[PDB]
Amino acid sequence: PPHGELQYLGQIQHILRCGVRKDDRTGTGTLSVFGMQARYSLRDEFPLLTTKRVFWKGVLEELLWFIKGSTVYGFQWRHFGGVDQLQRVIDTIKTNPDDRRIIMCAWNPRDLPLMKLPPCHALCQFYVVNSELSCQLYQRSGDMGLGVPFNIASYALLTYMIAHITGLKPGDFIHTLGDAHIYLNHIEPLKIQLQREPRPFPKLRILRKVEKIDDFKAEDFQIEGYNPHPTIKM
Amino acid sequence: PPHGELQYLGQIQHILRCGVRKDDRTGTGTLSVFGMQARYSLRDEFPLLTTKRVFWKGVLEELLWFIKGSTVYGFQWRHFGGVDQLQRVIDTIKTNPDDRRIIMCAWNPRDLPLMKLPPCHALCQFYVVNSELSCQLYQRSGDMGLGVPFNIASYALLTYMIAHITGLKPGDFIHTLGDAHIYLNHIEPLKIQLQREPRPFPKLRILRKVEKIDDFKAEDFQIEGYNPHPTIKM
């Protein structure tokens, strides 16, 4: 059965071959495809990409910062408007795991003063069946070179944390994109990364029994068997 | 190049083979898979499914009703809170086609009194490149037997209408799902539908030049070459 990372690499390859030139809001060039999806199993493994070294310390540390609600993304997750979207997701999983509305949303803070009721930007929908927690992240745009590998890890990590406190096993992480794009300057680096064969994904271990989302600390987590290709600067 | 309808049929086949039993909020049984996506070209054809007759008159007539903002889904599109989400999408396409925030959202009206800031339920994100308009619909759940074939047509139709008034050509419709499910009682009908070979999709023609979204009427639209298999009652 194929390595999950082959989806990301096939997606990079598709945008290079078929993506269209499209500028971003600074007028910086990208190659763009609209509408992408990939699924990474979280069962006995953790989708920290291996065709380049992903900055796991920054993934974990930033997620713990967001969860703290400190300032921005974490403020919205915990003080929406506030509504604690994150605790509500946890409480809903616990009171009605069948629920089709287990959804948390985030806004780009630059959008907030720009117009009335701006669209969100990213949503996470959680799903429970057979004691497994899955998560689907929809982002309205994804920087395939820099942001996407880091976000696969962050939201996979979030799903592990929530599965842990709700007593569920991690299931799948599904990453859905609107404008999936590669910045022009990342094209040569990505072409080299596409030459690299994925290695088996590592595992993530939680070293302690933790009861509340806010009680996790960086030392509670341990990545085992992470043996990536070298760092690619983008 | 494969018939777009093969995605839907492959998805039905996947849920029957691999879907898990999961109840809905009435306690009615389904087979469920979390996270699905399909892409239907809108270029010189229209994705009105052919392995069963889709109720096109009801698709068009209901969409025109939603667009009227009459009461519910249309009220939210046009009087959000209001904010006219639909006109804002049109105006944004016209003033900044590169924008990554061309998003309109809809809520299940039963959710509105149930809690503070309920999650949406469905979002449509629009995308423009090379004078083509694409649309991605994300629904938190999709009834694969009844709702999905009807919604592929409705949102494909909406994309045609918006492409028409903004002077763009229709591109792709991308349908993304959270809980994609088949109701237990639709399983035998769907198995029979899976035996049927798709025919070439019809075309949709707009018979008049229309300038404002509100000026369309049912007679402005004409489906040509629709030659589906017989009706399946679900």
UniProtKB/Swiss-Prot annotation, chains A, B:
Binding-site list for dUMP: R25, R100, R101, C120, H121, R140, S141, G142, D143, N151, H181, I182, Y183
Entry keyword set: Cytoplasm, Disease variant, Dyskeratosis congenita, Isopeptide bond, Membrane, Methyltransferase, Mitochondrion, Mitochondrion inner membrane, Nucleotide biosynthesis, Nucleus, Phosphoprotein, Transferase, Ubl conjugation
Catalytic activities: dUMP + (6R)-5,10-methylene-5,6,7,8-tetrahydrofolate = 7,8-dihydrofolate + dTMP
Location in chain, cross-link Glycyl lysine isopeptide (Lys-Gly) (interchain with G-Cter in SUMO2): K212, K217, K233
Molecular function via GO: folic acid binding; mRNA regulatory element binding translation repressor activity; sequence-specific mRNA binding; thymidylate synthase activity
Annotated InterPro entries: Thymidate_synth/dCMP_Mease, Thymidate_synth/dCMP_Mease_dom, Thymidate_synth/dCMP_Mease_sf, Thymidylate_synthase, Thymidylate_synthase_AS
Coiled-coil region list: none
Active-site residues from the entry: C120 (nucleophile)
Pathway recorded for this protein: Pyrimidine metabolism; dTTP biosynthesis
Binding residue positions for (6R)-5,10-methylene-5,6,7,8-tetrahydrofolate: D143
PANTHER family: THYMIDYLATE SYNTHASE, THYMIDYLATE SYNTHASE 1
Function comment: Catalyzes the reductive methylation of 2'-deoxyuridine 5'-monophosphate (dUMP) to thymidine 5'-monophosphate (dTMP), using the cosubstrate, 5,10- methylenetetrahydrofolate (CH2H4folate) as a 1-carbon donor and reductant and contributes to the de novo mitochondrial thymidylate biosynthesis pathway.
Family classification: Belongs to the thymidylate synthase family.
Protein name: Thymidylate synthase
Organism name: Homo sapiens (Human)
